[PDB]
Each structure stands twice: as C-alpha cells, then as structure tokens.
C-alpha cells in the first residue's frame, strides 16, 4: 500500500535535504566545530587560486594541488567501496529475489517434447530448473517426454520462455496451472522405456494425470 511520489515531489525532497545539509555545515563552520572549507583547486585552477605561491614554488604548489585532488578521489572511492555489496551478499540478494513464496500456492506447468536425446538440452533443463527452484521430473519415452515443472510464477514464465524460444520434433505446453502443494523434488530425468512404470512413477508423487494428458495428446497428434 505504498504511495508513489511525483517528480516535483522528489525534486522538493532532494532540494530541501541538500539545503538542510548545507545549512548544518555552515552552522558547524561558523560555530567553530568545523574548519572553513579550503578552495577547490585543479590543474586548470592552479594559477587562478595560487599564482603568487605557484611562482615561488612551482613543484611544491603542483604537489599540493595534486594531493588535494587525490584526496578528493580517494574519498570518493572510499565512499563507493565502503558501501559495496559483498560478493557473498550479492548472491544472498540474488538467491532471495529468485525464491518466490510458494506458501500461498505453487504454479505447475507440464510440457511434452517429441525428442530429448541431446545431453546438452538435458543439462540446460536441469540447470535452469535448479537455479529457478523449479522442482519437478523429466520422464523419457520414445515420443512422450513429460516435463513437470513446479515453482514460482516468475520462474515458470522464464522456463516456459526458455523452451519456447531459447531451446528448440517440437516442444508443446501440455498444461499450466496451480496446485496447493508441491509434489516433486529436484530434476532427476528418469528414463522410462515403457508406459506402465512411467505411470506408476507419476502415481508415486500423485500426479499421474499429467502423464495421462501427455500420453493422450501424443496419441491424438500421432493419429492426426
């Protein structure tokens, strides 16, 4: 139920925060708690700031100016690096944004592929499901290849796009839907030479209806 801010509102906030910070710094300087700010000097600004000093001691003034510039650059780098996501912390943010809450419900998609012989494609499916927390099963038959994928809606959409455009016999979405609870674990890529034990394995998880739909659709396609 958050409320967004208009661009004028953002400009007002930034302007008033910067003005408050400037007033605080000026008050600190005037009160004596802070030394007055020295003029900012660059190479092009060297003579305009200290021409009298640059004439007598050119190299000393050059060193002082470069020291001030390097101090500013070092402060900038320290501010940037100090506030930098640790390498493990980067993963923690990434490992969490991809973990959808399946407490409310799990989205299940069923795919049937004519051919899945390529080991590279098998590795692609397995790795993509593992990274996206897409628990499921792959059952290999002569023609039917039931790919049950369960997880979060974002992961489901990404994985559907994966086999629809990123990975190439054709790939057909059998059924996409939701269920109360998950019923399969990590990718296993079970080999099922015959239909009976494939149906039995799908019955072990209580999801034999996916196999039934895939087999019936494959039979109808073969007759067509």
């Amino acid at each position: 139920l958050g409320v967004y801010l208009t661009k004028k509102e953002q400009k007002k906030l930034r302007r008033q925060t910067r003005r408050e910070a400037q007033k605080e710094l000026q008050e600190k300087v005037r009160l004596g708690l802070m030394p007055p700010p020295e003029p900012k000097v660059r190479i092009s600004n060297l003579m305009r700031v200290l021409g009298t000093e640059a004439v007598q001691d050119p190299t000393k003034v050059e060193a002082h100016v470069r020291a001030q510039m390097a101090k500013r650059q070092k402060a900038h780098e320290e501010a940037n690096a100090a506030r930098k996501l640790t390498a493990e912390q980067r993963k923690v943010k990434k490992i969490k944004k991809l973990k959808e809450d399946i407490s409310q419900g799990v989205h299940i998609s069923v795919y049937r592929v004519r051919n899945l012989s390529n080991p590279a494609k098998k590795f692609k499916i397995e790795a993509n499901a593992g990274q996206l927390y897409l628990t499921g099963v792959v059952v290999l038959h002569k023609d039917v290849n039931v790919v049950v994928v369960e997880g979060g809606p974002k992961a489901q959409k990404k994985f559907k796009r994966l086999m629809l455009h990123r990975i190439k016999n054709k790939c057909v979405l059998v059924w996409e839907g939701t269920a109360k609870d998950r019923s399969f674990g990590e990718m296993k890529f079970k080999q099922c030479p015959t239909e009976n034990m494939a149906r039995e394995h799908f019955k072990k998880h209580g999801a034999e209806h996916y196999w039934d739909l895939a087999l019936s659709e494959s039979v109808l396609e073969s007759t067509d």
Binding site: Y4, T6, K7, K8, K157
Partner: protein, 124 residues
C-alpha cells in the same frame, strides 16, 4: 464499501502490482492519464489495458470505458483508490482512469502481458 457497479475490482496484491506497472509505464513514457485520454487511446487501439478508480463520484463518468474496452477487446480493471492511482501515474491530483499504451520493443511487454492475463481472469 465500493460501488458494486465496479465488478472487476482488484484485490490488494493485484492493486499493488497494477500501481507498480502504472508507475513503470509512466517512467517509460507509455501511460496516458485521465478518462478522456483513455477514451482516445481506446478509439485508436493503442491501449494495452485500462485502469480506472472505484471512488469516482459519480462512477458513471467512467463506466463508458468498460464498454469501449469490450468493443476494442482491451482488458480493464477497477482499483479501490483514485488518489493512489493518481500517485502511481506521477500526478498529485487524483486520476480516475489511466491507459497503458502500446510501444513496440518496450521492456514492459512481459509485465503488461502478465497483468493482462491476471486481469482477464478476475472479472468473473
């Protein structure tokens, strides 16, 4: 509560998602504010979906938008607040109707399609 005339009313989660998408569309220069601009987008067929508020008084001033959406085959949804909808559009003034336009190659296309699918299965 809300006016029963606004039957395709979104819940809290969909309201938040819709407001986020509206703000993103405003950032991408893909949004039209106001009922008149929504009508113009509907007549030109360049509207992905129409989001309108349920606090418009009277609500009949925007009840023509569902009819135009049905005629042009465009999803539409009702949000519970005309002040939060205006804020999502980037305008402090309340907005009772906003239209998300069609821009080819936009990075919001996937989110727009997901929101369209969510809306089209919520009306009944």
């Amino acid at each position: 509560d809300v006016n029963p005339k606004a039957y395709p009313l979104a819940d809290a989660h969909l309201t938040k998602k819709l407001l986020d998408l509206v703000q993103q569309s405003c950032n991408y220069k893909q949004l039209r504010k106001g009922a008149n601009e929504a009508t113009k987008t509907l007549n030109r067929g360049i509207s992905e979906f129409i989001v309108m508020a349920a606090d418009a008084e009277p609500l009949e001033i925007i009840l023509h938008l569902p009819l135009l959406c049905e005629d042009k085959n465009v999803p539409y949804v009702f949000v519970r607040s005309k002040q939060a909808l205006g804020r999502a559009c980037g305008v402090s003034r309340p907005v009772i109707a906003c239209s998300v336009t069609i821009k080819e190659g936009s990075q919001l296309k996937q989110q727009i399609q997901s929101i369209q699918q969510s809306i089209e299965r919520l009306l009944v």
